A = this chain, B = another copy of it.
Amino acid sequence: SIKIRDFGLGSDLISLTNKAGVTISFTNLGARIVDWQKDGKHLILGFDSAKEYLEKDAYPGATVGPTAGRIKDGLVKISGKDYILNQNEGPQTLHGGEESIHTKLWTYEVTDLGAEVQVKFSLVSNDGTNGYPGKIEMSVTHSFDDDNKWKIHYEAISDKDTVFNPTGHVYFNLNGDASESVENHGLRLAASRFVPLKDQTEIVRGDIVDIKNTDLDFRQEKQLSNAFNSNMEQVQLVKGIDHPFLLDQLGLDKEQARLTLDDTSISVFTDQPSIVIFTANFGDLGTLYHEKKQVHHGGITFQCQVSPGSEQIPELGDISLKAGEKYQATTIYSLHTKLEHHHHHH
């Protein structure tokens, strides 16, 4: 079933329930996921109204871009030309600049396919918005089906050569309570290398490093606490994890990550080359989620995209988008129960 209601400030809340009774909800403010529940438990972080996003933290569950992550000094080179983008984090351009796409009301249409329901959100980034050449016609389709798969499909076309590398900013917390650390979750991730950050400004260091057999090696499932407890320089730099992980094998067919807590698992599939993992390293900020004060490490993202820093590390990829060329990206989060035996204590 599909239900809709005002969510505040003129945004709407679109709630879907599949045949298995799992419910998931989205808002056109930022073409964002608001909630995902199984048996009355929140599997992700979200707020109860649009205003909360605008006043507390506008990134959770949002579609972010046109470029996700940090761009050093807001500088990109487009078809031999240098362009300077809005700089919203010091000299850095973070998630497309200030008042970016995650803050706008997108228009949308819902398509009921029966075993699958699609919510296609649309928005036009005008030419020159935040320094980006355009215009860019974007669309984000979120869909949920009877097999418990939540899929995100991105599409975009630009009138001018530009750059495009958006992502979905959901935060998982299988505890269903923001005040509970995700250190008790087990994580498996098919990546042998990561991108280190230069310093507290979080721009990339410039090298790619092998993490096999370190506390950041999750090729084989391990508790997140192993990482959180680590004193590796990179962990200490950010007080948790806030880095791009380079997938070892590409392809939408491969389970690239799996996050488990007791009998519940979330599997990640994508056609993108990397996954930026940020573990809500907010310290004592304590943003309130459903009246629960969020704890340091009270959430984790799986931002699938071309890794940030390609400006400095060309090997990471090319996010340029030629005029008239159609961009597409697909990311899938799937829910499972009793996928494996995960019985731990923290």
Contact = CB atoms under 8 A, between A and B. Distances in A.
Contact of A108 (B9, B106, B124): B9
A109 B128 CA distance: 29
A156 B219 CA distance: 53
A135 B100 CA distance: 11
Nearest to A29: B107
A103 B137 CA distance: 13
Total identical chains: 2
Interface residues of A, number: 30
Contact of A12 (B10, B103, B109): B10
A91 interface: no
Interface string A69-102: 0000000000000000010000000000111100
Interface string A224-260: 0000000000000000000000000000000000000
Interface string A110-131: 0000000000000010111111
B86 A126 contact: yes
A6 B10 contact: no
Contacts of A12: 6, 10
Interface string A211-230: 00000000000000000000
Contact of A129 (B4, B98, B105, B129): B129
A11 interface: yes
Closest 3 CB pairs of A and B: A105-B105, A128-B128, A9-B107
Interface of A: 4, 6, 9-12, 28-29, 50, 86, 97-100, 103-109, 124, 126-132, 135
